[PDB]
UniProtKB/Swiss-Prot annotation, chain A:
The gene coding this protein: GTF2H3
Keyword Endoplasmic reticulum part of the UniProt annotation: no
Zinc finger extent (C4-type): 237-254
Protein known as: General transcription factor IIH subunit 3
Matching Pfam families: Tfb4
Function: Component of the general transcription and DNA repair factor IIH (TFIIH) core complex, which is involved in general and transcription-coupled nucleotide excision repair (NER) of damaged DNA and, when complexed to CAK, in RNA transcription by RNA polymerase II. In NER, TFIIH acts by opening DNA around the lesion to allow the excision of the damaged oligonucleotide and its replacement by a new DNA fragment. In transcription, TFIIH has an essential role in transcription initiation.
From Swiss-Prot, chain B:
Protein name, UniProt field: General transcription factor IIH subunit 1
Residues of the full protein shown: 111 to 548 of 548
Subunit and partners: Component of the 7-subunit TFIIH core complex composed of XPB/ERCC3, XPD/ERCC2, GTF2H1, GTF2H2, GTF2H3, GTF2H4 and GTF2H5, which is active in NER. The core complex associates with the 3-subunit CDK-activating kinase (CAK) module composed of CCNH/cyclin H, CDK7 and MNAT1 to form the 10-subunit holoenzyme (holo-TFIIH) active in transcription. Interacts with PUF60.
Main localization category: nucleus
Native source organism of the sequence: Homo sapiens (Human)
Maturation and modification: (Microbial infection) Upon Rift valley fever virus infection, interacts with NSs leading to ubiquitination by the NSs-FBXO3 E3 ligase and proteasome-dependent degradation.
Main function: Component of the general transcription and DNA repair factor IIH (TFIIH) core complex, which is involved in general and transcription-coupled nucleotide excision repair (NER) of damaged DNA and, when complexed to CAK, in RNA transcription by RNA polymerase II. In NER, TFIIH acts by opening DNA around the lesion to allow the excision of the damaged oligonucleotide and its replacement by a new DNA fragment. In transcription, TFIIH has an essential role in transcription initiation.
From Swiss-Prot, chain C:
Subunit and partners: Component of the 7-subunit TFIIH core complex composed of XPB/ERCC3, XPD/ERCC2, GTF2H1, GTF2H2, GTF2H3, GTF2H4 and GTF2H5, which is active in NER. The core complex associates with the 3-subunit CDK-activating kinase (CAK) module composed of CCNH/cyclin H, CDK7 and MNAT1 to form the 10-subunit holoenzyme (holo-TFIIH) active in transcription. Interacts with GTF2H2 (p44) which stimulates the 5'-3' helicase activity of this subunit. Component of the MMXD complex, which includes CIAO1, ERCC2, CIAO2B, MMS19 and SLC25A5. Interacts with CIAO1 and CIAO2B; the interaction WITH CIAO2B is direct. (Microbial infection) Interacts with Epstein-Barr virus EBNA2.
Protein name in UniProt: General transcription and DNA repair factor IIH helicase subunit XPD
Documented effect of changing residue 235 to W: In TTD1; no longer interacts with GTF2H2/p44; has 5'-3' helicase activity
Outcome when changing residue 188 to W: No longer interacts with GTF2H2/p44, has 5'-3' helicase activity
Family the UniProt entry places it in: Belongs to the helicase family. RAD3/XPD subfamily.
Effect of residue 188 to R: In XP-D/CS; severe form
Localisation per UniProt entry: Nucleus; Cytoplasm, Cytoskeleton, Spindle
Portion held of the full protein: 488 to 730 of 760
Region (Mediates interaction with MMS19): 1-150
The record's account of how the chain is modified after translation: ISGylated.
Notes concerning its domains: Interacts with GTF2H2/p44 via the C-terminus of this protein; mutations in the C-terminal region of XPD do not alter its helicase activity, but prevent its interaction with and helicase stimulation by GTF2H2/p44.
Organism: Homo sapiens
Motif (Nuclear localization signal): 195-208
UniProtKB/Swiss-Prot annotation, chain D:
Outcome (variant: residue 373 to A): No effect on the transcriptional activity of the reconstituted TFIIH complex
Assembly: Component of the TFIID-containing RNA polymerase II pre-initiation complex that is composed of TBP and at least GTF2A1, GTF2A2, GTF2E1, GTF2E2, GTF2F1, GTF2H2, GTF2H3, GTF2H4, GTF2H5, GTF2B, TCEA1, ERCC2 and ERCC3. Component of the 7-subunit TFIIH core complex composed of XPB/ERCC3, XPD/ERCC2, GTF2H1, GTF2H2, GTF2H3, GTF2H4 and GTF2H5, which is active in NER. The core complex associates with the 3-subunit CDK-activating kinase (CAK) module composed of CCNH/cyclin H, CDK7 and MNAT1 to form the 10-subunit holoenzyme (holo-TFIIH) active in transcription. (Microbial infection) Interacts with varicella-zoster virus IE63 protein.
Protein name: General transcription factor IIH subunit 2
Phosphotyrosine found at: 88
Organism lineage string: Eukaryota, Metazoa, Chordata, Craniata, Vertebrata
Organism the protein comes from: Homo sapiens (Human)
SMART domains for this protein: C1_4, VWA
InterPro entries: C1-like_sf, Ssl1-like, TFIIH_C1-like_dom, TFIIH_SSL1/p44, VWF_A, vWFA_dom_sf, Znf_C2H2_type, Znf_RING/FYVE/PHD
GO molecular function, one term: RNA polymerase II general transcription initiation factor activity
Family: Belongs to the GTF2H2 family.
Length: 258, 191, 243, 380
């Protein structure tokens, strides 16, 4: 009767993976996809009632990615491979946009979790958690949407786990801190799957039983309204609580509201 | 005089602070009482390269993980590892004995009071406050020389691994940098 | 219900507090009268009006309270104001009483039922929220004037001597106690510190607009029971309503 | 006439059959009528707010010993005050709370005006075991509150809450002059009595612009406190009110790195027990002072430390999401898959955003308009 839903958000930003491939490093996007598929198969093998969802983010949008081995796992892997191949082959750079649309993927994941919750029988509770792997740099332009997503996830009690590969993201740290999730930075990319099989694999009840690394130093720098950049000290309005980097005779937001 | 003596006797911490700040000539008594009162087309080339590389992609099983990598990850995730540092101030409650801890708390209180006076003076909008900030800086330097240097010597003699002095040094350096920046801006405004 | 009339019989010591002529000098009854006013002064705020049978009984009442360590307890709760025969002294006493009830200090107005101040002023809302009758006010039978009227009505209009005295006693008692309700929004508390009021022959002498609100449940309840009724009534009468 | 004296209502007449089995389809509409029962707004009231400096006056006379509320008035009052402080700090990010206790015809400032909830809760818990003596003095408490709030900036809303248990107050001077002074000073005063209505409190509430209430039961007391929790509405633009406040990042320390810098929290120094010299915590952006609780104004430089998520949580009120247009499925020409949950659109109505022109089902529309507060399509 214990229903566990795992949603894996994969940062498939073409620029970062292209740079990694040009670096000729030991880790590639193919290995990351294989590790994600193995983690999903392990999660499904943990319990029959467990459900899996995979969403891949891109500059364009978010795509729902979902012979000796399990038949259902074979079909799931084939579907994931077909979806990722379709997304990558049809991915055409049309515009100057480069930041990953991480907020949209999280919103779609929350919508999918909400949809699945209603279909769940009343006698069972569907415990849901979201795992995010970060490859490219964080986007500061989507601060408000990211915070809204964090608050929505906290309202429904949905864990958010962050697995940073190269560049640490403050937004992911804040999400993990607020939602109670786990934030972890990968020291060695080729060993990534092992971490996925050691830290994020157990459920929240199982995490209490086991011993986990302490949370990293979470930052709480805000984003200025007129700059959309991280700041430490700024001017905050006393009415709409808007944050400004520099003093202004009149609040722009308050002037907007009539 | 009698009122000052009574006030000092009432609070032993205040008496100790007055002894450390006035008897050691760190600050004058008058000031103490007054205070009390992107790139080129290389990105597109990389995008095309990764698109072509992942266009012909096949799943792998053996290449995903290796025994050495798994063992290294387990060792790192084992207690006492890099990600599982088990020290985390193991005996901080018993390290740096409370006799030193009381002195550290007194120094923290003194630094907090002096920096509170400094930040209350800031910003300097009148010529009167210009000399007061200089006096506060001189008092801070005298307090540092009088207390922190013997404190650092005592720590070195007892060989404490805790970086207790680091926080005080950071606060003093931040205050000095802020004062230097404000003085430079004041000089620039006169140019 | 803008009024909560009730009749208090025996006190907390299960002793009647009737203002009988033979029991005026009794120490047991006079203690209960002060005891009744003690907790009453702390439940109804900003104005209590108390009427006594006569000045002679009034001056002896406060003297007993002053002699004991009881009157001082009332002083710290509310200011004690005594109405005298002098008009000028009464006016200033009323003047300070009005401002005392205006703020939160509170005051107690002590007077006589058959006095010029009983009907000369009207206790509008927020003034005199509680009216206390210390015994049935009976006119003095001396001076050989009332008895002459009683004899004339006896053989001419066949008027019962006891009934006329009861009629006169209740008329003045009901007239003064009825001055605490002036206006639809006005409300007040009405008490009777005498077991003689509880008898049917005197309850029927109350006006019909007070009879229906005088429930038979509270006709002989003690001082402590009367306080609880007063607390419950005043607590629920402060809520907002509609016109 | 009377509404029920006419014809009897037949509610079952609504259902009809034309093809002998169409009734099911009708109940489907009932299912569609089951949802969308809200106004798509969790509050639907005041969409803005303003900083409040609220002072709570607590009676300490013998009347608090009365057993109207179990066990006594003082204990229930302090418990409900703790609940009120918690809720008020939850719903007000940059508000301040002061506590004044009146006893023996005097007023004592029990707790300083600050935004720390734990300090106020600890002070109230300590005051639980106090001694009730003397009589209250509203004049002294009001004078202290006015003296404290006179120097506060005008843009801040100055509010005073008085819990008056005893029905008598001793004023060393005239109180109506103080009421006029408070009215001239633009201060809000609210009184919640316990025993009965008091004329002076009603006059004070009427002239000062506040509200006066009388407690019926503990539930009514809690309802009154919850009503007082809600911030008063504010104008669109009042003045140039801005405050410089810091955002202390929670930078912990580890022995693995070379930046393991233990420090003592400023708040914990005044504690009787040994202050917690943990690995790290919240460091002031201005003077690097260490604190363990937020929101706490910095003791050294006077800077205000506020948590960014707390401020950001109220941003959805500033920019509410416009309701999507209800379009029937037949009249819509496009994909029949939801943009949010990727589910097939089989409902009688499909909601389309007016900006990104995406399609969302009923469940996704409700989730966006109630919890997400942002359109997923507009994000891209
Ligand atoms: Zn700005
Ligand atoms: Zn504003
Ligand atoms: Zn600071
Ligand atoms: Zn949907
Ligand atoms: Zn939209």
């Amino acid at each position: 009767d214990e229903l566990n839903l795992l949603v894996i958000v994969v940062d498939a930003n073409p620029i970062w993976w292209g740079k990694q491939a040009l670096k000729e490093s030991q880790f590639t996007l193919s290995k990351c996809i294989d590790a994600v598929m193995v983690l999903g198969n392990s999660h499904l093998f943990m319990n029959r009632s467990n459900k899996l969802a995979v969403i891949a983010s891109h500059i364009q949008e978010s795509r729902f990615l979902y012979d000796g081995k399990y038949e259902l796992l074979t079909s799931a892997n084939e579907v994931i491979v077909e979806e990722i191949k379709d997304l990558m082959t049809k991915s055409d750079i049309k515009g100057q946009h480069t930041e990953t649309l991480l907020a949209g993927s999280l919103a779609k994941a929350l919508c999918y979790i909400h949809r699945m919750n209603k279909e769940v029988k009343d006698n069972q509770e569907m415990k849901s958690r979201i795992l995010v792997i970060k490859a490219a740099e964080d986007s500061a332009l989507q601060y408000m949407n990211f915070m809204n997503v964090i608050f929505a996830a906290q309202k429904q009690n949905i864990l958010i786990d962050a697995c940073v590969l190269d560049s640490d993201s403050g937004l992911l740290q804040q999400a993990c801190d607020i939602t109670g999730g786990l934030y972890l930075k990968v020291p060695q990319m080729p060993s990534l799957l092992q971490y996925l099989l050691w830290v994020f694999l157990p459920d929240q009840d199982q995490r209490s039983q086991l011993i986990l690394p302490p949370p990293v130093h979470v930052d709480y720098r805000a984003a200025c309204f007129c700059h959309r950049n991280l700041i430490e000290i700024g001017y905050v309005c006393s009415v709409c609580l808007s944050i400004f980097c520099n003093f202004s005779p009149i609040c722009t937001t308050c002037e907007t509201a009539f | 005089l009698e009122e000052k003596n009574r006030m000092l006797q009432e609070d032993p911490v205040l008496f100790q602070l007055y002894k450390d700040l006035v008897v050691s000539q760190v600050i004058s008594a008058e000031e103490f009482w007054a205070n009390r009162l992107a790139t080129s087309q290389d990105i597109i080339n990389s995008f095309q390269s990764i698109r072509q590389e992942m266009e012909a992609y096949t799943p792998k099983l053996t290449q995903v993980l290796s025994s050495s990598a798994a063992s290294s990850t387990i060792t790192a995730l084992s207690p006492g590892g890099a990600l599982m540092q088990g020290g985390t101030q193991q005996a901080i409650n018993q390290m740096v004995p409370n006799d030193i801890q009381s002195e550290l708390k007194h120094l923290y209180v003194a630094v907090g009071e002096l920096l509170r006076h400094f930040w209350s003076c800031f910003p300097v909008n009148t010529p009167f406050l210009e000399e007061k900030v200089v006096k506060m800086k001189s008092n801070l330097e005298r307090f540092q020389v009088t207390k922190l240097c013997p404190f650092q010597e005592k720590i070195r003699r007892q060989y404490l691994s805790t970086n207790l002095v680091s926080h005080i040094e950071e606060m003093l350096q931040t205050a000095y940098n802020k004062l230097h920046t404000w003085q430079s801006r004041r000089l620039m405004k006169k140019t | 219900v803008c009024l909560c009339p009730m009749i208090i019989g025996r006190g907390n010591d299960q002793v009647a507090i009737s203002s009988k002529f033979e029991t005026r000098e009794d120490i047991a009854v006079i203690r209960n009268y002060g005891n009744l006013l003690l907790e009453m002064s702390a439940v109804v705020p900003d104005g209590i009006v108390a009427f006594f049978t006569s000045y002679q009984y009034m001056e002896s009442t406060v003297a007993s309270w002053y002699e004991q360590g009881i009157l001082e307890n009332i002083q710290r709760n509310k200011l004690l104001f005594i109405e005298t025969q002098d008009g000028a002294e009464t006016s200033v006493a009323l003047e300070k009483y009005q401002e005392a009830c205006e703020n939160g200090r509170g005051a107690i107005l002590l007077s006589v039922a058959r006095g010029k101040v009983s009907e000369g002023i009207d206790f509008v809302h927020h003034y005199g929220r509680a009216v206390i009758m210390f015994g049935v006010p009976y006119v003095y039978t001396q001076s050989r004037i009332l008895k002459a009227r009683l004899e004339y009505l006896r053989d001419q209009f066949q008027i019962r001597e006891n009934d006329f005295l009861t009629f006169d006693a209740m008329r003045h008692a009901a007239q003064c106690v009825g001055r605490a309700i002036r206006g639809k929004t006005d409300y007040g508390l009405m008490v009777f510190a005498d077991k003689r009021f509880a008898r049917g022959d005197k309850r029927g002498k109350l006006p019909r607009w007070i009879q229906e609100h005088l429930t038979d449940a509270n006709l002989n309840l003690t001082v402590d029971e009367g306080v609880q009724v007063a607390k419950y009534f005043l607590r629920q009468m402060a809520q907002p309503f509609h016109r | 006439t009377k509404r029920w004296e006419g014809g009897y209502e037949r509610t079952w007449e609504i259902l009809k059959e034309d093809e002998s089995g169409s009734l099911k389809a009708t109940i489907e509409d009932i299912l569609f009528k089951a949802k969308r029962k809200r106004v798509f707004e969790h509050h639907g009231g005041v969409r803005l707010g303003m900083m409040r400096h609220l002072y709570v006056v607590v009676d300490g006379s013998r009347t608090m010993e009365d057993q109207d509320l179990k066990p006594n008035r003082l204990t229930c009052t302090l418990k409900l005050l703790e609940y009120f402080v918690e809720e008020y700090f939850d719903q007000n990010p940059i508000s301040q709370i002061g506590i004044i206790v009146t006893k023996s015809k005097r007023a004592e400032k029990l707790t300083e005006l600050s935004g720390n909830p734990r300090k106020h809760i600890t002070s109230l818990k300590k005051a639980v075991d106090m001694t009730c003596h003397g009589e209250p003095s509203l004049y002294n408490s009001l004078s202290i509150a006015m003296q404290t709030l006179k120097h506060m900036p005008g843009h801040t809303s100055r509010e005073v809450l008085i819990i008056f248990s005893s029905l008598t107050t001793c004023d060393p001077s005239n109180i109506y002059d103080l009421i006029k002074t408070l009215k001239a000073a633009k201060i809000r005063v609210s009184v919640i009595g316990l025993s009965a209505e008091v004329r002076v409190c009603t006059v004070l509430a009427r002239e000062t612009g506040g509200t006066y209430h009388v407690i019926l039961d503990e539930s009514h007391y809690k309802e009154l406190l919850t009503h007082h929790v809600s911030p008063p509405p504010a104008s669109s633009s009042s003045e140039c009110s801005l405050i410089r406040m810091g955002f202390p990042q929670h930078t912990i320390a580890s022995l693995s790195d070379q930046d393991a810098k233990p420090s003592f929290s400023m708040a914990h120094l005044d504690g009787n027990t040994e202050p917690g010299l943990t690995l790290g915590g919240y460091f002031c952006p201005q003077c690097r002072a260490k604190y363990c609780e937020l929101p706490v104004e910095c003791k050294i430089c006077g800077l205000t430390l506020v948590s960014a998520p707390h401020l950001a949580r109220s941003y959805h009120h500033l920019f509410p999401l416009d309701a999507f247009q209800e379009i029937p499925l037949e009249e819509y020409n496009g994909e029949r898959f939801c943009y949010g949950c990727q589910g097939e659109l089989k409902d009688q109505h499909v909601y389309v955003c007016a900006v990104c022109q995406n399609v969302f089902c009923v469940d996704c529309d409700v989730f966006v308009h109630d919890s997400l507060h942002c359109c997923p399509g507009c994000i891209h």
